[PDB]
């Protein structure tokens, strides 16, 4: 019964309790806000090719 003197908690159960959640990448906040601000650039810039300014406040010709 030498196995009953070993620590009963496995090496697996350490690695699943220590690394419980996959950690958040540092660049995940950049490349998710950049792709969402590329839609703020597109719609709202006045130099974008797809601006909303001509379909929101139309024109007066």
């Amino acid at each position: 019964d030498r196995v009953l003197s070993l620590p009963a908690v496995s090496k697996n159960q350490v690695l699943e309790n220590v690394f419980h959640t996959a950690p958040k990448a540092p660049v995940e906040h950049l490349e998710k806000m950049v792709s969402a601000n590329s839609k703020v650039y597109d719609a709202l810039n006045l130099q974008s090719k797809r601006v909303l300014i001509w379909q929101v406040k139309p024109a007066l010709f």
């Binding site: 419980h20 950690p23 998710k32 806000m33 969402a36 839609k39 703020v40 797809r50 909303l52």
Partner: protein, 95 residues
Amino acid sequence: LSNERYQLLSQWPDFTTMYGKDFYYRAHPEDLKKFYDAADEYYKLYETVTEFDSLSALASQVVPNYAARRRSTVHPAIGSTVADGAFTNFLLSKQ
């Protein structure tokens, strides 16, 4: 209107300042699932409030019901307050 919702996503606390492993390992493992779910939730809210190309198709859900109320058989500009005040001219005159 989509600006008034974007202005309150401007006031969201910077959760990425708590992404380090000195916050990962001090925190309860279920309060870190919730913190990583509340950060994934902000990217859901922020990527849909900046979907401004979807506002043009939302305006076409307001137009056809409005335009049918203007196709009134009485008048395009008729309303209740005029048609009530023109009932007393009809009722409180003789027959």
